Design a protein around this ligand. Structure first.
Ligand SMILES: NC(=O)c1ccc[n+]([C@@H]2O[C@H](COP(=O)([O-])OP(=O)(O)OC[C@H]3O[C@@H](n4cnc5c(N)ncnc54)[C@H](OP(=O)(O)O)[C@@H]3O)[C@@H](O)[C@H]2O)c1
Ligand code: SF4
Lengths: 59, 64, 111, 313, 147, 171, 80, 95
């Protein structure tokens, strides 16, 4: 079917080059990656402590 | 939940809070006026030496 | 006192080692091994040179560290001396360091 | 002297209570419950490790070395805990003639803890973790002094007492905009719990300064390695943060200074969980090849600024 | 008399509090041993912190099949452990071969190489059943040093 | 108790014996930290915190480069302890007699010296400097300067350019 | 354009940090020579006294008075 | 005078250290930085006691050049091991 992993260079001229250069000069996308686990901290953990709570099973 | 996270921060708000207050509040017993003099260069050092010499006698820093 | 401040921290640190040294004792068998971490007998016994790979980049640090030490006057010296005479000389050391790193770009090494 | 003893025992507790945060904040970052069983919120577990690792754990290395090895955990604590002394705080313990020079010298001397642990085991397996720890620290000592010099020339002299007074209206983050971003990376020069980090954590290679050490020396290493993380967090909160001074009321400063540092204390453990290791070769290419020409260009920029507009202490 | 008896329990409370496991990537049991780190069934800072290195850890969990090629390897790792050490053989392979047992390469039951204190019988060792392997360990530590 | 610098100078020579009496660049490497770090205290007690802590900045950093060749190149065969070898320990035992036997003559009267100058006691004379300057104090207080010695800035900048290019030709 | 605009965008595409290393360091040399504010900073640097004042013997001298507030020599009044 | 005699005695031991060679070549490069360390302490005490201010810049220049030779000699140590195996004073061909 072919999905293709290669993007064949997203940058071309002026507008497409400068924004791709801005993320490599400072960070931006790493701060975007930093914010990915920020929301993960905010949501409740799906944790079960054994001596009191028990896990799901089958008949 | 943050009700589990906040006691981990509150325990740090006591232990790390100590070195700031322990340095400042000890100046009451060590010196008369809750202040330790800054040395840097001999000019400020000489002012402390003549203070201890002039009628303070035993005390390093004392008013009048 | 600086001497009394440094020694009290150092003596308390070494005393904590003694607590962990004398209290736990029961048996010491021929059980401890040379490499550890992953297991098995050490194929590389004692010591062997290895070396290389970072030999050029490490040497350049010893050369560069002297210049940064010579850059340390900047915030502390520029108070009494004339600024216009200093401007030509203060930048001069920083410019030439970029020139040496420009020569470092043409084949950096194995690293 | 009472102040030094009131800056080791409560400080070792801060490195002890760090172990909570090291798996509570890091836990919620990974969506998992950390300390819970031992105490009310696992608060009795950090103090339990001191009973666990020292009193009962006995190891000494096999082939070993002579006096060195056990000299290294003494070098670990006795050079990293001394770093607390030159700190300006509200009031410093023996205010140095030049402040930051003692901070930069003893930090490089603290690197020796992981260096002497290479000769802890005579076997070659341990020294690979030491040789990797050389380059992951040796290169980053260059910029650490340069980025300091650009900030120091902007505000005051080397004295740490003047760095508090210089920030009366606004922080030093805004004038030193690219330089503040550098001190999230350059602070991780020492072997710290991070993504950039050094040869200390497991992941790919064997644990540096831990595979040779026991429990008792190895336990003493963590009380020094995690101590440096707080030290860099406070040091960033002096050079880049400030907000207010107030010499009359020390109470208003002590609360406000801790919140600024604690936000940075979370930020390094935020870095640790989020990103993979940068590799031995490619960390040497982040700096030196890419970041060193950037920092020197800003160093060139910060030389001209006091001459362009009056800025001399 | 009473202070001496309670101090021994205080030292034993430290092992009741926290024990660091070893990441023995030995078989399929090691995958369920990774499920102890997985949030749904967690011992992460409940009493277990993964760090590896046999020199630092207190408890080693033999997670799967051992062979004659592995018998000299695991033995000295147990010797590299600090003297207060506990071995939890988890799985049927760790108890005497899942199938195997009558095979040529597999060493039977780990006890031929290294002594075991707590046994876990489960092939696919369910994380629910695995939690006993650490909780019963803490319960078994009762008394040390009378004189 | 009156002596501050004199006790530190004993520790200074103590580390220097582990150089003539060769203990390998790891035990001999320690000397640059032990006697080097105490050697900063000799500079610091006389005055000038800048130049005193300047020794710490290079002789520890540059020693890491030396450490990058202790576990490399040549020395990785045997540790070679200065307490084991008969040829090494013989130089150390005669090395300590060059230092510890000299201190024996310091106590009571002036010490005997190979040089013409007498050592004497000198406790208060150890500083040998008056207060004099107050504002912008110490000769070391404004030590490093780009002005006056403008010619010295150029050649130091040249010598740190030469090395980088030269080492590239060698390797 | 041959190298002014054509070659500048090539530095932005591959290794973009090289642009900032030349531009920021380049402006650090040009600005202190052309801007009309640099001469003011040297004036205050010379005005600030490090050492104590020296008294000279007066015998027919212009622009010299007592230590009291009076118009003598010059005295700095550059911006408050 | 008094303090100078101890650091001069440290110089003489490091002087012998540069003239003594055993097995490895690494001892010389330690003693090269060692002898420069002893000269630096001697320079620091002489200039500061009888104050100079202008000539206190001179040991800072000396400290820069202290490792200038040491960095080049340590880089020469690298190429000897590449030609041979391990750097040895005992192993030489030229007459
Ligand atoms: N020096 C020699 O090698 C040598 C020379 C000639 C003959 N031998 C003979 O060979 C034998 C060697 O044995 P060993 O000395 O190796 O044994 P051991 O190490 O003393 O071990 C004996 C064990 O029995 C327990 N035990 C003994 N008496 C006890 C009491 N009254 N109450 C409670 N527990 C007690 C101890 O437990 P706890 O530690 O828990 O109390 C100990 O673990 C000796 O019996 C001796 O006659 C030895
Ligand atoms: S006991 Fe079962 S799950 Fe465990 S290693 Fe053996 S076959 Fe795999």
């Amino acid at each position: 079917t072919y999905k293709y992993v290669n993007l064949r260079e997203p940058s071309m001229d002026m507008k497409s080059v400068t924004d791709r250069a801005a993320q490599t000069l400072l960070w931006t996308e790493l701060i975007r990656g930093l914010g990915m686990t920020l929301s993960y901290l905010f949501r409740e953990p799906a944790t079960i402590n054994y001596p009191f709570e028990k896990g799901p099973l089958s008949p | 939940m943050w009700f589990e996270v906040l006691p981990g921060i509150a325990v740090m708000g006591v232990c790390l809070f100590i070195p700031g207050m322990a340095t400042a509040r000890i100046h009451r017993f060590s010196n008369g006026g809750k202040e330790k003099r800054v040395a840097h260069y001999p000019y400020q050092w000489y002012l402390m030496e003549r203070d201890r010499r002039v009628s303070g006698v035993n005390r390093s820093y004392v008013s009048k | 006192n600086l001497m009394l401040a440094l020694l009290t921290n150092f003596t308390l640190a070494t005393l904590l080692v003694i607590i962990a040294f004398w209290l736990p004792q029961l048996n010491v068998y021929s059980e401890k091994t040379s490499p550890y971490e992953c297991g098995f007998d050490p194929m590389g016994s004692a010591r062997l040179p290895f070396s290389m790979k970072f030999f050029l980049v490490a040497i350049t640090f010893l050369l560069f560290d002297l210049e940064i030490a010579l850059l340390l006057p900047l915030p502390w010296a520029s108070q009494t001396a004339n600024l216009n005479t200093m401007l030509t000389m203060a930048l001069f050391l920083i410019i030439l360091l970029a020139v040496s790193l420009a020569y470092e770009w043409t084949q950096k090494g194995l690293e | 002297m009472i102040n030094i003893l009131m800056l080791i025992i409560p400080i070792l507790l801060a490195v002890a209570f760090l172990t909570l945060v090291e798996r509570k904040v890091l836990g919620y970052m990974q969506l998992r419950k950390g300390p819970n069983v031992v105490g009310p919120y696992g608060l009795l577990q950090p103090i339990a490790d001191a009973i666990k690792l020292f009193i009962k754990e006995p190891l000494r290395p096999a082939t070993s070395s002579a006096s060195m090895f056990i000299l290294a955990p003494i070098m670990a604590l006795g050079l990293a805990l001394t770093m607390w002394i030159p700190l300006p705080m509200p009031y410093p313990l023996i205010n140095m003639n030049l402040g930051v020079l003692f901070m930069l010298a003893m930090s490089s001397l603290a690197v020796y803890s992981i260096l002497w642990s290479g000769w802890a085991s005579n076997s070659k397996y341990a020294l690979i973790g030491a040789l990797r720890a050389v380059a992951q620290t040796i290169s980053y000592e260059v910029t650490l002094a340069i980025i300091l010099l650009s900030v120091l020339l902007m505000s005051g002299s080397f004295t740490l007492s003047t760095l508090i007074t210089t920030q009366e209206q606004m922080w030093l983050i805004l004038p030193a905009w690219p330089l503040a971003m550098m001190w999230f990376i350059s602070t991780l020069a020492e072997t710290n719990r991070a993504p950039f980090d050094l040869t200390e954590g497991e992941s790919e290679l064997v644990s540096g300064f831990n595979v040779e050490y026991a429990a008792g020396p190895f336990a003493l290493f963590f009380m020094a390695e995690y101590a440096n993380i707080i030290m860099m967090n406070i040091f960033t909160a002096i050079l880049f943060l400030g907000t207010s001074h107030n010499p009359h009321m020390p109470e208003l400063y002590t609360i406000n200074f801790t919140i600024k540092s604690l936000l940075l204390t979370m930020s390094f453990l935020w870095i640790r969980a989020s990103y993979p290791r940068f590799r031995y070769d490619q960390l040497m290419h982040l700096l030196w090849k890419n970041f060193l020409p950037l920092t020197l260009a800003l160093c060139m920029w910060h030389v001209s600024l006091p001459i362009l507009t009056s800025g001399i202490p | 008399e009473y202070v001496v008896a309670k101090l021994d329990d205080l030292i034993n409370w430290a092992r009741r509090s926290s024990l660091w496991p070893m990441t023995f990537g030995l078989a399929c049991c090691a995958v369920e041993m990774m499920h102890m780190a997985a949030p749904r069934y967690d011992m992460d800072r409940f009493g277990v912190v993964f760090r590896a290195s046999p020199r630092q850890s207190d408890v080693m969990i033999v997670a799967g099949t051992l062979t004659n090629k592995m018998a000299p390897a695991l033995r000295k790792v147990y010797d590299q452990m600090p003297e207060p050490r506990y071995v939890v053989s988890m799985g049927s392979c760790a108890n005497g071969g899942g199938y195997y047992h009558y095979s040529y390469s597999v060493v039977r039951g780990c006890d031929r190489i290294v002594p075991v204190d707590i046994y876990v019988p489960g092939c696919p060792p369910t994380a629910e059943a695995l939690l006993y392997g650490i909780l019963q360990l803490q319960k078994k530590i009762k008394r040390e040093k009378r004189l | 108790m009156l002596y501050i610098v004199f006790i530190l100078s004993v520790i200074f020579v103590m580390g220097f014996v582990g150089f003539s009496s060769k203990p390998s660049p790891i035990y001999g490497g320690l000397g640059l930290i032990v006697s080097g770090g105490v050697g900063c205290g000799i500079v610091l007690n006389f005055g000038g915190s800048f130049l005193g802590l300047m020794v710490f900045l290079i002789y520890l950093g540059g020693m890491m480069v030396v450490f990058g060749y202790t576990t490399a190149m040549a020395t990785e065969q045997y540790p070679e302890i200065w307490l084991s070898n008969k040829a090494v320990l013989g130089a150390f035992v005669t090395g300590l007699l060059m230092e510890f036997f000299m201190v024996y003559y310091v106590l009571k009267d002036k010490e005997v010296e190979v040089v013409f100058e007498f050592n004497g006691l000198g406790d208060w004379v150890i500083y040998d400097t008056g207060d004099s300057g107050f504002f912008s104090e110490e000769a070391m207080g404004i030590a490093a300067l780009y002005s006056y010695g403008t010619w010295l800035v150029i050649v130091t900048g040249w010598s740190l350019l030469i090395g980088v290019v030269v080492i590239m030709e060698i390797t | 354009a041959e190298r002014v605009a054509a070659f500048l965008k090539n530095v932005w595409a591959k290794e973009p940090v090289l642009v900032a290393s030349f531009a920021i360091a380049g402006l650090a040399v040009i600005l202190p020579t052309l801007s009309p504010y640099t001469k003011y900073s040297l004036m205050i640097n010379x005005x600030x006294x490090x050492x104590x004042x020296x008294x000279x013997x007066x015998x027919x001298x212009x622009x010299x008075x007592x230590x009291x507030x009076x118009x003598x020599x010059x005295x700095x009044x550059x911006x408050x | 005078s008094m303090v100078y005699m101890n650091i001069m005695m440290a110089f003489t031991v490091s002087l012998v250290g540069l003239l003594m060679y055993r097995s490895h070549l690494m001892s010389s490069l330690l003693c090269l930085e060692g002898m420069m360390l002893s000269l630096f302490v001697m320079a620091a005490l002489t200039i500061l006691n009888s104050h100079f201010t202008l000539a206190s810049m001179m040991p800072i220049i000396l400290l820069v050049f202290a490792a200038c030779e040491a960095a080049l000699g340590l880089s020469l140590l690298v190429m000897v091991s590449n030609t041979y195996g391990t750097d040895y004073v005992q192993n030489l061909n030229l007459l």
